């Protein structure tokens, strides 16, 4: 199937004392595999998946040097941005950056992205062409002119189309056992009386991977959105995900309702009904 490698970086300034709090995390699909936390003891990029631990010391030294360079760029950025927005030296502010690459079923480059945010709002983003920039406001327009002059998009396009995709293929091979395994949702239905004549039916999808899934209710074969509740997909904490969808029904009419589950791990979508 399709795959992605994504890195997420957050820095939060601490005006009272010291340098910004910095957290970097790397993912292959929905699996976290590396992390860096400026508050952690190691001061190194750390493994978070068994398949990355086999990488040699030149790998770890290189990733540590680059992630510490990212933290310093963010520290400088927080200063520049405070100036662009005429903000006080007293408030805490945040910079977020995410970049990465997607590959198709053939494991060839599909798309790349690089987005930057200041105080939780879009600041500057590389366009899908990997050549152009989307600047949200006039401060970002100043950055865009500097990035054009400094060949930033060319350096990113070379990384996203080359290095990013090459290492993603390497990780998918080394971590085959889990990364290329799809875990279809384990599904069941629960019934919760809300009175002596109505009940909630809850359709559960557990222990699935990747996180992408669709749970939909139907009544007599037509989609039902009235009296439904769908929770956001959530992590189980063991690398898999969970979700549920519920509908309130008149008691005795449960057989009209069907829950439909779509997931990459299912060749054909599942249909569940309440078993009285």
């Amino acid at each position: 199937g399709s795959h992605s490698m994504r890195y997420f970086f957050t820095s939060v300034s601490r005006p009272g004392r010291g340098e910004p709090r910095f957290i970097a995390v790397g993912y292959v699909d929905d699996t976290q595999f590396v992390r860096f936390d400026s508050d952690a003891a190691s001061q190194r990029m750390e493994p978070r998946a068994p398949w990355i631990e086999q990488e040699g010391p030149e790998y770890w030294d290189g990733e540590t040097r680059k992630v510490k360079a990212h933290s310093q760029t963010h520290r400088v950025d927080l200063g520049t941005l405070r100036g662009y927005y005429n903000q006080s030296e007293a408030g805490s502010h945040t910079v977020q950056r995410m970049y990465g690459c997607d590959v198709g079923s053939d494991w060839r480059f599909l798309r790349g992205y690089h987005q930057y945010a200041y105080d939780g709002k879009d600041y500057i983003a590389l366009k899908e062409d990997l050549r152009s920039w989307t600047a949200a406001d006039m401060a970002a327009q100043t950055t865009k002119h500097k990035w054009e002059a400094a060949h930033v998009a060319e350096q990113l396009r070379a990384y996203l189309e080359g290095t990013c995709v090459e290492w993603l293929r390497r990780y998918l091979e080394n971590g085959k056992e889990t990364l290329q395994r799809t875990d279809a949702p384990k599904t069941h239905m629960t019934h919760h009386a809300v009175s002596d004549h109505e009940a909630t039916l809850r359709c559960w999808a557990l222990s699935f991977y990747p996180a992408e899934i669709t749970l939909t209710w139907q009544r007599d074969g037509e989609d039902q959105t009235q009296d439904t509740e769908l929770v956001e997909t959530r992590p189980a904490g063991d690398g898999t995900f969970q979700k549920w969808a519920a509908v309130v029904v008149p008691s005795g009419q449960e057989q009209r309702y069907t829950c439909h589950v779509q997931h990459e791990g299912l060749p054909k979508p599942l249909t569940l009904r309440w078993e009285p």
């Binding site: 970097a24 400088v76 950025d77 500097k146 930033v152 350096q155 990384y159």
Partner: peptide, 9 residues
Amino acid sequence: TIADYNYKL
């Protein structure tokens, strides 16, 4: 692997 790139905001 993370990017090795340079930029100034």
